[PDB]
Amino acid sequence: SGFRKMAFPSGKVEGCMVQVTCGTTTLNGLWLDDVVYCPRHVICTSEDMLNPNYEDLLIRKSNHNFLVQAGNVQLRVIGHSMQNCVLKLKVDTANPKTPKYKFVRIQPGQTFSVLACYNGSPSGVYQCAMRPNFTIKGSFLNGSCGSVGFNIDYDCVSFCYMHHMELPTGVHAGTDLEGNFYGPFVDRQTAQAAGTDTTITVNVLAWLYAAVINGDRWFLNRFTTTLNDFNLVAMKYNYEPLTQDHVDILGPLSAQTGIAVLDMCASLKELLQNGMNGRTILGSALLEDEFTPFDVVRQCSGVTFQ
């Protein structure tokens, strides 16, 4: 048993991280087949980052301006292309460690693992969730750009995120692997604010189910509620509205625990109105919303604890 914020094994992603240097700017790149993907602001310097015209800056560079290092091996850039906010550097060598992969754009409320890299060398891995305002609460320092977020379906790496910048509130923003930003953010050092964040309700309910599968049942109650009366309380507490599709997604967890979804919503309503009164759920004193129903099933279905 037990429940932890679990990241996917990073071995298949570690073999694709490279270091991309353009002038004095150095960041991480994703080496898949004979293409290296990296944030396009590697072509900028300190005087450019306020408001750079990236097409102007890119046309002033050629293939020899990009130094790509894969460990101690240097890759020759034989072609370059800008795809929205990411650079696509064609190199002379196909990555022999290239796993089967896909480029997917995830939804708010979904999770993924982050491999934080510095100078093409991975240093840590952790799980992240895309907030409803298209930000993530990660851990990124200088030189961490090019770090990728990913999920592993079976043997196929689903790349979904590339890190680009940090907002003034401490949250982080980036793009998918096609260069399209998550949210209304742009890769320039101007005053940018994320939208008002909300709590992912379906994730909280799945996390409550994980507590019951692990034997934390003090929050359960005899009450039940309608979906509309729950959504009325969810709005007051800045929770996303619960849909009928969310209830269907929580179906497998509802059957394994024997607790109806609307019964669990009545427990969440009491937790929202009353609080926890000093108690904890799965070792946490607040309601967690960074666990998807998939994350719970993958960690808790081999348990009963009836």
Binding site: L27, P39, H41, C44, M49, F140, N142, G143, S144, C145, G146, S147, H163, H164, M165, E166, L167, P168, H172, A173, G174, F185, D187, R188, Q189, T190, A191, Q192
Partner: peptide, 5 residues
């Protein structure tokens, strides 16, 4: 305010 990585 936003800082590029």
């Amino acid at each position: 305010x936003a800082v590029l990585x």
